[PDB]
Design a protein around this ligand. Structure first.
Ligand SMILES: [Zn+2]
Length: 74
């Protein structure tokens, strides 16, 4: 799925968590799992990517709003 903007990928699903890497707009990401975290533009859903860090799902163009795949473990 493409990211919708330049999008931070963080060590935890929080906008205060450390930035591991930043994807340039349109970069293809795969979703390992989904969880909840900071509310970003109305969505508290966060996606763990192929790199093991978390992005705000609002900015991942999947067509889905709610969690739709494997839930991340605690
Ligand atoms: Zn930023």
């Amino acid at each position: 799925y493409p990211v919708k903007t330049d999008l931070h990928c963080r060590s935890s699903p929080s906008t205060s968590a450390s930035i591991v890497r930043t994807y340039s707009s349109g970069t293809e990401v795969q979703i390992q799992c989904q969880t909840t975290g900071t509310s970003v533009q109305g969505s508290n859903v966060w996606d763990k990517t192929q790199h093991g860090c978390y992005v705000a799902d609002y900015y991942v163009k999947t067509g889905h709003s709610g969690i739709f795949t494997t839930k991340c473990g605690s």
